[PDB]
Amino acid sequence: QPFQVLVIPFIKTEANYQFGVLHRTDADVWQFVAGGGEDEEAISETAKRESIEELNLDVDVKMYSLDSHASIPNFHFSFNKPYVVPEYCFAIDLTSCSYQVTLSLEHSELRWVSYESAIQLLEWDSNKTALYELNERLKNNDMKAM
């Protein structure tokens, strides 16, 4: 095995970068794309899938790894050990791409926001750290190779 993935949507604008934060319907929570590994999926396979599903994307979406990862208490997901499961992070570039959020309790809207505004909106520390890393990498044209 169990693991989770987190996927941050971003776009390049003329002035800055913006980031795609999602708002849940069942709680006042801003988060990113998230979900669990299924069947025999590799980690990056899980991230691509959840991205394509949650946002209704085209299959050739550009996706990048991030170093940031964190543990999640496993009871959020499983009755069983392990006690905690890892959350692996990625980012997806939706510059000039069609999308629309899949309406669900996990998210009813998406909003494109500045780094600073996403930091104020985001519920979870793991999301904020992952975003920090992404923003730094974008600014420095220093993404991990994909």
* By the rule CB under 8 A, 86 interacts with a second copy: yes
Give CA–CA dist 121/132, Å, rounded: 14
Instruction: Report whether 102 contacts 56 (CB < 8 A).
Output: yes
Is residue 31 within 8 Å of residue 24, measured between CB atoms? yes
- The two tokens of residue 102 are 């899949």
Token digits for 15?
A: 């002035």
User: Which of the choices a second copy, Ca ion, none does residue 35 contact, using the CB cut-off of 5 to 8 A by kind?
Assistant: Ca ion
In sign, the C-alpha dihedral spanning 110, 100, 17, 68 is positive
Show the binding pattern over residues 36-65: x = contacts Ca ion (CB under 5 A), - = does not: --------------x---------------
Angle at the Cα of 32 (from 28 to 37), degrees rounded to 5?
A: 120
Binding to a second copy by CB under 8 A, coded x per residue (else -) over 38-77, reads -----------------------------xxxxxxx----
- Which of Ca ion, a second copy, none binds 49 (CB below 5-8 Å, type-dependent)? none
Minimum CB separation of residue 53 from a second copy in Å reads 25
Residues at the interface with Ca ion (CB under 5 A): 35, 50
Residues at the interface with a second copy (CB under 8 A): 67-73, 82-84, 86, 124-126, 129-130, 132-133, 136-137
